[PDB]
Design a protein around this ligand. Structure first.
Ligand SMILES: *[C@@H]1O[C@H](CO)[C@@H](O)[C@H](O)[C@H]1NC(C)=O
Lengths: 48, 48, 48, 49
């Protein structure tokens, strides 16, 4: 709970009246994509 | 587009949202750098 | 009384004109703003 | 006469690391600097008001 988060931040079981900066929020990624050049030619490794 | 995703273009991997851009890239130009030298505008290998 | 009132009004007008026409009159506040902005820009630049 | 300066704030992990995540995992073992910075900047911000 945010109250529990504040308690953990202050390292005490009671917090006085006021405003406290606890942590930061950031939205997580939803999916993943990948893009590469459209090549389908194998490299000449057997010939080497 | 318009979704928080973790992408990788030609081995350059990063997390963010990809949007349509109106920057006038030169035909030879590929990347785009900000003040902090972190990639900001990219050209995908396919569909150019 | 009238002479002093006239002098006071003329002085106020001259103060307005002098503040309008002097570029270095307000240097201190601009210096504060410039200091803060330059420090922040230096911080964001050192990341590269 | 200047009176107050601009109240600023910083995010520790966003600047020190990048968009990656195990970088923060490495960061967790370097100490508790973030508390010091947050406390000092909060003090400055309240001093401005
Ligand atoms: C391969 O990629 C190119 C460039 O994006 C595209 O023009 C072409 O249609 C693609 N071919 C196939 C079979 O997907």
């Amino acid at each position: 709970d945010p109250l529990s988060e504040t308690k953990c931040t202050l390292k005490s079981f009671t917090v006085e009246k006021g405003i406290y900066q606890t942590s930061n929020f950031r939205v997580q990624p939803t999916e993943s994509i990948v893009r590469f050049p459209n090549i389908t030619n194998l490299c000449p490794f057997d010939e080497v | 587009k318009n979704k928080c995703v973790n992408f990788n273009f030609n081995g350059l991997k990063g997390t963010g949202v990809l949007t349509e851009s109106n920057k006038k890239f030169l035909p030879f130009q590929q990347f785009g750098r900000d003040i902090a030298d972190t990639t900001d505008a990219v050209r995908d290998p396919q569909t150019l | 009384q009238k002479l002093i009132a006239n002098q006071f009004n003329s002085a106020i007008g001259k103060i307005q004109d002098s503040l309008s026409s002097t570029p270095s009159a307000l240097g201190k506040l601009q210096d504060v703003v410039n200091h803060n902005a330059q420090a922040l820009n230096t911080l964001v630049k050192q990341l590269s | 006469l200047p009176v107050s300066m601009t109240k600023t704030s910083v995010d520790c992990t966003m600047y020190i690391c990048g968009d990656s995540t195990e970088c923060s995992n490495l960061l967790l073992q370097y100490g508790s600097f973030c508390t010091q910075l947050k406390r000092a900047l909060t003090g400055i911000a309240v001093e401005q008001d």
